[PDB]
Design a protein around this ligand. Structure first.
Ligand SMILES: [Cl-]
Ligand SMILES: [Cl-]
Lengths: 209, 196, 208, 192, 202, 198
């Protein structure tokens, strides 16, 4: 009924991958691997997607989740295999990647010089890297939620920031990044730019004529 | 306020009733499932049901949005408590939201990775690589119990996973492909009988 | 965005605070502190709120939570500090406390004499005190969910009841209170009236 | 093998019963070592059936079986288990009270720390508290049940599975003291 | 300090494999991969073992656990890679692959025809294959706990039994097998013999 | 029947503090906090200990648990208040601070460069900061368990390491520290010498 995301991660970054590895129930990715993430509604449709994907290439599935509303599949491996499995999944889902719901940024803020108590509270909630008092913190909320992994991975590509937390499953996705102010602003720019590439996908046709 | 389900089950099956915290002895156990919004309204329903007749409640839950009551026992007792609940809920069963099958699929011979992933999410019997799988999603969620009970009647399948509480309900059944096909048709027809 | 609640608790009550302390991960309040509760959508907006509130006065945050949809901040301390932090948070959120979504009661009911099996069933889900067979039970569902803490705290002020359950985070908030029928009806009346004064916030302008 | 416990509760009290819900009938509780021996016990006890087993656990070391329902059927199942074990209900390890204390008027901090640790009713700042630790653990149900039966107290916390069992009771100091006496005397055994 | 077990499994059986996949936090082993299991005390020693093991060969770790007292490592791979990793780890543990603590059967029973409620109770406790009323049930408790993996796997090799439940981490290990009564006893005595050949010393 | 530990911490460090539910109040060593940790057997004896301590001084109790066999209390605050509460606690137990069981280091190791999947496995086990592949690691196991907080606090004040995992409750305590090789080696020496002073 709804393709909420169809996300190719060309190369997973270390902190992003390490954070995934903290909670995902499936196969744990090797360094620098490509990955595909698919989110659908209704959630249970993802079971059929997973069946098709796994049986079309040698990919390792790290995520299979049917939450309250939506279903999620992630798989990774050699780039060739990931693309092949993704393409099979896509054909199963209508064959058009631009049918996917565009990401929306619901909230984004850079908090400069995080307060001591505030860092303590965040570090109690988060399962990734530690935020320090005085650091800057970037927070981003996106829907569909799965797009949080794209925002996070692209942020890490562009800046030496810490992945404090990111959630890519639910009604909305969340991204928490910390570091020096310049690094955090740079990382925030890259995360927003990554979503903008998707938001402006149909611009491609305008440029091809 | 809305009545999301008013489900009567004539004959509970072993795997299905296991989720309700009961089992069949030796020597017919009926059950009634009720789902409502707003969720806390189920407390008034429970108060009326459990008082009017003596039955055994396996479920009393208020989740994010919806409220759930299930009780079971001998047919007379169950139907007695159910009618008292119904009168409290307006006295008309047709007011209940009709079930909608959101997704349903037969997956022949599941991959070893797929089995692995399901087993790490499931509440039910371990699924093995190569087994055939039937998956089914329904809203309202509580209708999952009716589809699972009817499926269990019709075929020798194992209940791999089962959720009847939430925005949607879910059923994972495994077995040979022949049994799964039977289970699937029965589950689907069960959700079509309550439509008619 | 959306300011879902902006709630000031003048004096946190024992059970309310004890129940709160049961699950919260932030700092724990001592006897009869004041508290402020703020709920927003989108949830992640609460982080900026927290930054402002905690920088402007010496308060202790008990709750910093972003759930499925909404975000929650609770903090407490001496009265002056809580109000200072609260007004700072308020200025950040627009300056108008009446921009907050007014509480709606979705369900409320007193069960006069709870069945023994019913009492058992409730006790499996609840984290507060147990409801006992024969006792009266008040149940209340409110949206936005955070208003549950105000209903509960005010209930405890007005009557000697047991806080059986109290949920203030989610799509809807829930309150379960038990005890003698007299006490429970008294608590129920105070819980609803507390929500009523907020619902009638704009009557103030009419009266002055 | 080792019979650690063979306890009959004539009439379960509501708070004791309700606490078990997170898992006025008679009950039987049987603890054994090694733990997996409880499966043979359960197969013998429950083949009779007629009772409803609320607990079947094999923890780190010890095995637990609890079944309740109406009295006669419980005892019949209990006797069936008994014959299977050693066939005499006094080879069971008698309880040892490792620690027991009445704590007058709990501090507000103390209350909160207890409340986030425990399942069961809420202890409130100012209330008095009775605490008791016994081994074998399962005897905690006996002390707890007889305490609630004898006094007007809240079962704050209660654990009957593990190396040692625990009871937390709160209320007025007067009520807590009566519970304490009953809890301690319930664990009193004749031995000579 | 003590080596509590040093177990090589040539091929993991389907149900044993599927059951591991239900709880282990590492990589799932594929059908008929070799696997090595190492249990040690003190528990934290297993971190050093793990470091040496993963760095000497290309293996996949399925289990890394430091429980109340003991530490556990499991890794699987091609037989060659596994053996190389295990020999490295063994050398790191001094050597002598037989200095390991010998299995001790604390309890062993065939329940011939399990009754209804007992089945219901077991079914709500276990996370493996479901036991049916009337089936036979083999229960086996062993110390050190990690020997349960060897008993279970070998029992599944011997007869068509269902792996209801098995636990290989803790003070003691447990094995629950079900099926027809004939197959349960072959499985049981294969489980015992798998442990017995390790028990005995000359 | 047994005093397993009676630990005084002169000044708590931020990461160690977080496990006690507190933090450094602003950027000032003014509000530096001492803490006292007490572990006993039988576990339930800690409830009487807590009652005595909390009522003799203005301290903040951050830990109160009775596990399988042992009981744990921790409270922090100003140095004078902490010592006052501790002394009353000590008086209640027997008045002998040196009667506490001596800490034993069951295992300790520096792992120079964590393998990729090793970091995965640790991260899925830990309570603390995320460890990354390539980072160095110091692991330490100690009995009684509560002594882990002393080794961890001392390590933290001596080096720029991340507390990846920390357990101070159970049969044995555990601490995982990560960082550069230099930082981890300094933290190791400090943690070991902290348990050696005793
Ligand atoms: Cl809540
Ligand atoms: Cl327990």
């Amino acid at each position: 009924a709804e393709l909420r995301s169809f996300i190719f991660i060309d190369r997973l970054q270390p902190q992003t991958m390490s954070y995934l590895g903290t909670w995902i129930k499936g196969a744990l990715p090797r360094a620098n691997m490509a990955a595909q993430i698919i989110e659908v509604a209704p959630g249970l449709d993802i079971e059929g997607v997973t069946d098709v994907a796994l049986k079309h290439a040698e990919v390792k599935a790290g995520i299979l989740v049917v939450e309250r509303q939506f279903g999620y599949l992630e798989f990774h491996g050699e780039t060739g295999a990931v693309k092949a499995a993704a393409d099979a999944a896509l054909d199963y889902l209508g064959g058009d990647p631009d049918a996917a719901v565009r990401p929306e940024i619901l909230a984004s803020r850079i908090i400069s010089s995080i307060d001591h108590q505030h860092a303590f509270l965040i570090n109690r909630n988060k399962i990734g890297s530690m935020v320090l008092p005085g650091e800057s913190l970037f927070v981003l909320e996106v829907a569909p939620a799965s797009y949080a992994i794209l925002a996070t991975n692209e942020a890490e590509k562009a800046a030496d920031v810490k992945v404090v937390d990111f959630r890519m499953i639910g009604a909305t996705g969340r991204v928490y990044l910390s570091g020096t102010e310049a690094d955090v602003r740079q990382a925030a720019d890259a995360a927003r730019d990554a979503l903008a590439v998707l938001q402006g996908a149909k611009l491609a046709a305008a440029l091809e004529h």
